[PDB]
Amino acid sequence: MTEYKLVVVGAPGVGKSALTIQLIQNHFVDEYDPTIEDSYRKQVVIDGETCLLDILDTAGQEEYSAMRDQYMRTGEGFLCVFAINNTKSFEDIHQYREQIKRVKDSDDVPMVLVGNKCDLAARTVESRQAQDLARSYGIPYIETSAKTRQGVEDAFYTLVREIRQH
Amino acid sequence: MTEYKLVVVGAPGVGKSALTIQLIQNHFVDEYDPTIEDSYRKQVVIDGETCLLDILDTAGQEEYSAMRDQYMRTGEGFLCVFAINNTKSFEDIHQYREQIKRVKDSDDVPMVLVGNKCDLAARTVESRQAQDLARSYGIPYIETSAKTRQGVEDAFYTLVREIRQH
Ligand SMILES: Nc1nc2c(ncn2[C@@H]2O[C@H](COP(=O)(O)OP(=O)(O)CP(=O)(O)O)[C@@H](O)[C@H]2O)c(=O)[nH]1
Ligand SMILES: Nc1nc2c(ncn2[C@@H]2O[C@H](COP(=O)(O)OP(=O)(O)CP(=O)(O)O)[C@@H](O)[C@H]2O)c(=O)[nH]1
Ligand SMILES: [Mn+2]
Numbered sequence A, B: 001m002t003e004y005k006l007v008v009v010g011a012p013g014v015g016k017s018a019l020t021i022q023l024i025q026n027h028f029v030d031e032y033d034p035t036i037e038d039s040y041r042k043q044v045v046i047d048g049e050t051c052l053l054d055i056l057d058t059a060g061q062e063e064y065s066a067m068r069d070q071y072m073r074t075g076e077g078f079l080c081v082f083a084i085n086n087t088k089s090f091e092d093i094h095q096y097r098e099q100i101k102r103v104k105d106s107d108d109v110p111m112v113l114v115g116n117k118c119d120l121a122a123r124t125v126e127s128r129q130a131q132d133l134a135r136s137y138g139i140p141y142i143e144t145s146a147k148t149r150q151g152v153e154d155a156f157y158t159l160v161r162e163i164r165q166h
C-alpha cells in the first residue's frame, strides 16, 4: 500500500509527542517525558485510500541537529508545530523550516504549520500572526489541541493530502 | 469579521443538502426534499479565526443553469459533490467545474472534490478514480458521509483554507 513518511518537528515542549499519541493511541499524555526519537506506524484509510502513516516523532534541541538532517532527508511531509502560549517556539519555526528546505533542496516541501495547545486561555501568539506566516510560507495553518483532540486528524490528514498534490 | 461565501454544487441527489445540514444543524436528513436554493449563515471559529460561513446550497438540474451562473459568480469557494454509488454524478463533475471556470474567468478557483455517501457498501466509483481526477484538477479530494458525519467538517474547513491561500 501507499506509505506516507511524516515527520513532526518543533521546539522542545510544544506537544509534538502529545499530538502523535492522540492520533495513534487515543489519549492525551500529560506527563513530562522528553523524546529522542520515536517512530509510529499505522494502517489507516484516508479518503478511501488504504495507506500506512509512518510517523517520525523527533526531539527538539541542538543535541539533535545531527539526527535531524538525517531524518528530514527521508520525510515526505512535515508537521511544523509551535505552542500558542509560547512565542519563542513560534519564532523558532523559521529555523526548522529553513533546515528542512536545506536538506530537501526545496523551496516547497509538503508542510503544515500547527499551532498547538489551543485549549489554553493564555495565548501569546495570535492566530492572525501565525496565519500570515503560513501564507508567506505558502502552507496551511491548523490550530490543534492534543488535550481535547481538536484539529488533530485535520492536521495529519491535511499533510497527507498536501503530499498527494505535490 | 471575515466572511467566506461557499457554494455547494453537484448532480441532483448526491447529498448536497445533507452535508450542509449536518454541518449546521447536527443531524442527518434522510428525507426526499429537493432544493431550489437555500442559504445558511453561521458564525464559526476555524483555526482561531472568527468568521462567518455563508453557504449557498444549490439545485442540481438544467432548470437552474440561470440561477447557477448568478450564484457561481459571487461564490469564493465551491464544494463539488458526487456520490460514490453514482457514476453518472461523478462524470457530471466535469460539467460543473467547467461552468464555474467560465463564470469565474479562472482556471483556478478554490474548490474541493467531495465523494459523498462513503458509508454505503455499494461503491461504483473507486477512490483512486476520484483521486486522479482531483490531482488533474489540482484540488483536494475528500470523502464524506452526511450520514455518519465522517469528513464533513474536513471538507468545509479545507475549502475555507483553500480560499485563504488563494
Ligand atoms: N493543555 C495542553 N497541554 C498540552 C498539549 N499538548 C501537549 N501538552 C503538554 O505539554 C507538555 C509537553 O508535551 P509533549 O507532547 O511531551 O511535547 P514535546 O514537544 O513532544 C516535548 P519534547 O520536545 O522534549 O520531545 C506535556 O505536559 C503535555 O501534556 C495541548 O494541546 N494542550
Ligand atoms: N447513506 C447516505 N445517504 C445519504 C448521504 N447523504 C445524503 N444521503 C441521502 O441521499 C438523498 C438525497 O440527499 P439530499 O441531501 O437531499 O441531496 P441533494 O443533492 O441535496 C438533492 P437536490 O439536488 O434535489 O437538492 C437523501 O435521501 C439523503 O438522506 C450519505 O452520506 N449517506
Ligand atoms: Mn516528544
Ligand SMILES: [Mn+2]
Binding pocket: B016, B017, B018, B033, B034, B035, B057, B058
Ligand atoms: Mn438539496
